[PDB]
Amino acid sequence: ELKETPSQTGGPYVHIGLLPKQANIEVFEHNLDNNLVQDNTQGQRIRLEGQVFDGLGLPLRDVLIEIWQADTNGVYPSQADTQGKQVDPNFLGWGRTGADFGTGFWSFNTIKPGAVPGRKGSTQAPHISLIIFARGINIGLHTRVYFDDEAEANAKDPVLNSIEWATRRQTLVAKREERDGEVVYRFDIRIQGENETVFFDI
């Protein structure tokens, strides 16, 4: 048996390789980005945005974020999804973005995901899987984003209920807002300190 290749920080220039446009490098015709909504994509459009803070309360302006999620019916656009249901054909389920170098704000344009089956016949509340990479972070940090308007589903979610310190569950719930008809969920991530965001080993 082999050992997993060890992780190393993405470093401060993670953009050169993963978001060349943000570093002003035009070498690719097709560029991966933070827009998961195609014209025919099904579902309600939402904007997910926030900042990532370090232990001093300062935003990380060099952080790279990716999200992975199911479509509107809770099916993953992946060959490993075993639900036997047809997934939305116009949905990648994944996106990548970088915090703005000046403000530290990051965002994605996506769709609110449907509920996905949990283990042993349970049902998971709607969520988006998120990972963070940056200078100073030796291994990508995994977390999840749940939605404050799904209180009933959140209360029965297996993963949230597996966090024994109940007070920390709230760090995983994004707050719904409405900027000009657009639905926006705000999710700030606190890497260290008070109200530290829960991170998972998945």
């Binding site: 060890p6 992780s7 690719f28 998945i202």
Partner: protein, 238 residues
């Protein structure tokens, strides 16, 4: 075959989050332990990238940004295999790489090192592994880079890489180094990895029989991702 969950990540084979010798980790590491969860469909699935969207020079760092001439530096080919921990090939995984140029200079707004910029070098590439888990790209060997951790800190020459494969649980970003570089022994970033055998797993090896005469050298570097176990009894994934 009915697949179950990925095997647990062995935390002793990776660096810890808090590693005081790498100074920026002090404020960017959680103080709470990670919460381990049992995997669901969310962790065992991942996106698919079609080869159709990749350009013909996406894996050729020597030519993909060349404008007026060739970039300056040591021509090298890097190749190898991506496998999971049980030895199975990892097919159609997205491999992205980025690095500095021959001077140790990154084409990035935040890099002000005096090492000279090369107008014909960009420093990023990508490729999909094939059915045998094989990948190959060509580039200019990067130069070591000074940085401020302690004041006279120097990274050994390295190429940054990222893999998106079959399951989200396999998601990994790391860096590989070149056989014989003396800076490898002094780097505080490489020293965040606890074991000597794991530090050696990041060193690409000179592959002399695969050098191309009067043209390019070659380095071999294999990558191992987490692997899925098969299920023969109860399938509790869903």
């Amino acid at each position: 075959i009915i697949w179950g969950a990925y095997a647990q990540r062995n935390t002793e084979d990776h660096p810890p989050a808090y590693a005081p010798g790498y100074k920026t980790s002090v404020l960017r590491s959680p103080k709470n332990a990670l919460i381990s969860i049992a995997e669901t469909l969310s962790e065992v699935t991942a996106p698919h990238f079609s080869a159709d969207k990749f350009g013909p020079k996406d894996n050729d760092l020597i030519l993909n940004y060349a404008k007026d001439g060739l970039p300056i530096g040591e021509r090298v080919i890097v190749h190898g295999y991506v496998r999971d921990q049980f030895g199975r090939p990892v097919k159609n995984a997205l491999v992205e790489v980025w690095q500095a140029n021959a001077s140790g200079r990154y084409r990035h707004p935040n890099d002000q090192y005096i090492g000279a910029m090369d107008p014909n070098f960009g420093g990023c590439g990508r490729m999909l592994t094939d059915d045998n888990g094989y990948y190959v790209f060509r580039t200019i060997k990067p130069g070591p880079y000074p940085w401020r951790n302690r004041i006279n800190e120097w990274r050994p020459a390295h190429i940054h890489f990222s893999l998106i494969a079959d399951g989200w649980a396999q998601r990994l970003i790391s860096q590989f180094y070149f056989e014989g570089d003396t800076l490898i022994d002094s780097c505080p970033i490489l020293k965040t990895i606890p074991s000597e055998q794991q530090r050696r797993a990041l060193i690409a090896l000179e592959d002399k029989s695969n050098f191309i005469e009067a043209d390019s050298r070659c380095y071999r570097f294999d990558i191992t991702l987490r692997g899925r176990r098969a299920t023969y009894f109860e399938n509790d994934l869903t």
